[PDB]
Amino acid sequence: SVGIVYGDQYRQLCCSSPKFGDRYALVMDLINAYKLIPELSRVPPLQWDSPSRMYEAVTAFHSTEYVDALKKLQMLHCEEKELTADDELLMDSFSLNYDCPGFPSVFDYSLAAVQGSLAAASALICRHCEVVINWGGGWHHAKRSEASGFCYLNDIVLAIHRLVSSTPQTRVLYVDLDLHHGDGVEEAFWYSPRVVTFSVHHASPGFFPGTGTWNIFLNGAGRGRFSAFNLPLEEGINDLDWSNAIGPILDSLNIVIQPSYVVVQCGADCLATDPHRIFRLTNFYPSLSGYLYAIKKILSWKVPTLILGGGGYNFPDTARLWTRVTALTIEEVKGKKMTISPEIPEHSYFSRYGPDFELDIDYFPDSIQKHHRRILEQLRNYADLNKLIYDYDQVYQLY
């Protein structure tokens, strides 16, 4: 079945941040308005037997001192008195300031994404679900001891760690479709050949987070050399050109790596209508949405997959895209046609889809060849280092 993470408390916590507000509610309510909920298997977020069990789970990646600081930041934001100078210095030491501030539910909010993504990994491992979606997860920037880019705990790293460690040779392919470089996940697995990371994103001078591009092109280290793939793209790319840029890379990675699991971060900030206004992707499903092209391709591999959210700052448009991704996932996994009306159905949040109330977003739609040659050579180097056997000509021809 296709699983999806949701629950009453989970929705309350996912809607508690100052940056993302009620985005998760709009997404889940639009999926519910389109009558998709009965086609999906609810995956409950993971809850623990004790504070010690929760710390053991989160500290599989994060440091205890960072988790302690994040918990303290929540406690302090639950009192009226301002922080002491010492507490401000402590929070600054973990980058819990500026664009990653505290708020009354910061720890419960961050931990909820981890609870959802670990449960989603568990549902794949026990084979209850072929695919699991978590629109409350996908926080790719958080590091071992540092908050970054509105990400406090890295639910993706923790979910991948659960997938990789599920066997007593498991390989995971991580694909990051967000407008931003998936730096936190790439860094977490920089030295591991068992987790291959691939991020497609915009990169340009001063654009966050500044990595995933020429620096030379770094691609992992130690036994993880050649295991971190990146495709930086110039501003203004449309659905067709982004699809042609990533299509052969995705197919080649699947052929060579033969992953046991795929984890996809589907941040919606590439949409033409996102306030970043950098890429020109759509949610159109007749050009065809780059996101839908990539998801349909990944699902065609028939490998257990986790689909996560991420960025997306135009809330109704992110809900429009993720509702289409959810319906496509049902169609591809089950072979059950999911007919979605081009008109938004009446529901609680209907007014947020005005003035047109349509499902399609309101939009009228050599560098890459060099990247393809570079990525092909890196994949050959990865395969050689890891003693994997593949047909070079079968892979060369995809490009």
Ligand X SMILES: CN(C)c1ccc(C(=O)NCCCCCCC(=O)NO)cc1
Out of 62, 140, 141, 371, the active site residue is 141
**Minimum Å distance from CB 180 to Zn ion?**
4
Q: Does 217 bind ligand X (CB under 6 A)?
A: no
Binding partner selected for residue 201 from K ion, ligand X, Zn ion, none, CB under the kind-specific 5 to 8 Å limit: K ion
Q: Does 232 bind Zn ion (CB under 5 A)?
A: no
Inter-residue contact 372 to 249 (CB < 8 Å): yes
Span from 83-91, 169-177, 212-220, 311-319 in contact with Zn ion (CB under 5 A): 311-319
Give me the helices (H) in the chain, please: 8-14, 23-33, 51-58, 64-77, 85-92, 106-125, 155-164, 183-188, 239-257, 290-299, 315-334, 367-385, 392-398
Least distance CB 179 / ligand X (angstroms):
6
259 lies in the binding site for ligand X (CB under 6 A): no
Q: Which of 74, 199, 213, 378 binds K ion (CB under 5 A)?
A: 199
- Closest separation between CB of residue 42 and K ion, Å? 28
* C-alpha distance from residue 275 to each of 270, 315, 364 (Å): 10, 10, 16
Of 302 and 370, the one with the shorter C-beta distance to ligand X is 302
- Our CB check for ligand X shows the closer of 26 and 383 to be 26
Residue of minimal CB distance from Zn ion?
311
User: Rounded to the nearest whole angstrom, what is the least distance from the CB of residue 269 to ligand X in the complex?
Assistant: 5
Question: Which of Zn ion, ligand X, K ion, none does residue 176 bind (CB under 5 to 8 Å by kind)?
Answer: K ion
Using CA atoms, how far residue 58 sits from 55, 76, 117, 172, 382, in Å, is 5, 21, 12, 20, 30
What distance in Å separates the CA atoms of residue 373 and residue 369, rounded to the nearest whole number?
Answer: 6
Task: Retrieve residue 136's tokens.
Answer: 């409350």
Decide: is 311 part of the binding site for ligand X (CB under 6 A).
Answer: yes
The reply to whether 206 sits near ligand X by the rule CB under 6 A is: no
Least distance to ligand X from the beta carbon of 148, Å? Answer: 8
* Binding piece for K ion, criterion CB under 5 A, among 32-40, 54-62, 224-232, 276-284: 224-232
Residue 180 is assigned to a ligand binding site: yes
Nearest approach in angstroms of CB 186 to K ion is: 7
Amino acid at 10: Y
Report how far apart, in Å, the C-alpha atoms of 341 and of each of 33, 326, 327 are: 11, 14, 12
End-to-end Cα separation, the chain, in angstroms: 33
| Burial of 391 from C-beta contacts in 10 A (0-12 / 13-18 / 19+) | exposed
Place of tokens 């999911």: 338
Residues 6+ apart with CB under 8 A from 47: 115
Q: Does the footprint of ligand X cover residue 131 (CB under 6 A)?
A: yes
Phi, psi of 163 (to 5 degrees): -65, -50
Q: Are 305 and 262 within 8 A, CB to CB?
A: yes
| Residues 160-199: x where in contact with Zn ion by CB under 5 A, - otherwise, as a string | ------------------xxx-------------------
Q: Which residues contact 79 (CB under 8 A, 6 or more apart)?
A: none
Q: Binding segment for ligand X among 46-54, 155-163, 222-230, 330-338 (CB under 6 A)?
A: 330-338
Annotated binding-site residue? 178: yes
Q: What share of the chain is helix, strand, coil (3-state, %, to 5)?
A: 40, 10, 45
What value, to the nearest 5°, has the Cα angle with vertex 99 and ends 96 and 102? 45
62 is catalytic: no
| DSSP assignment string, 256-294 | HH--SEEEEE--STTBTTSTT---BB--------HHHHH
Considering the rule CB under 6 A, would residue 208 count as an interface residue with ligand X?
A: yes
153-192 footprint of ligand X as x/- string (CB under 6 A): -------------------------x-x------------
Tell me which residues touch K ion (CB under 5 A): 176, 178, 182, 189, 192, 195, 199, 201, 224, 227
Any idea which residues carry the catalytic annotation?
A: 141
Tell me which residues touch Zn ion (CB under 5 A): 178-180, 267, 269, 311
The annotation places the binding site for Zn(2+) at 178, 180, 269
Tell me which residues touch ligand X (CB under 6 A): 98-99, 130-131, 141, 149-150, 178, 180, 208, 267, 269, 299, 302-305, 310-311, 332-333, 335
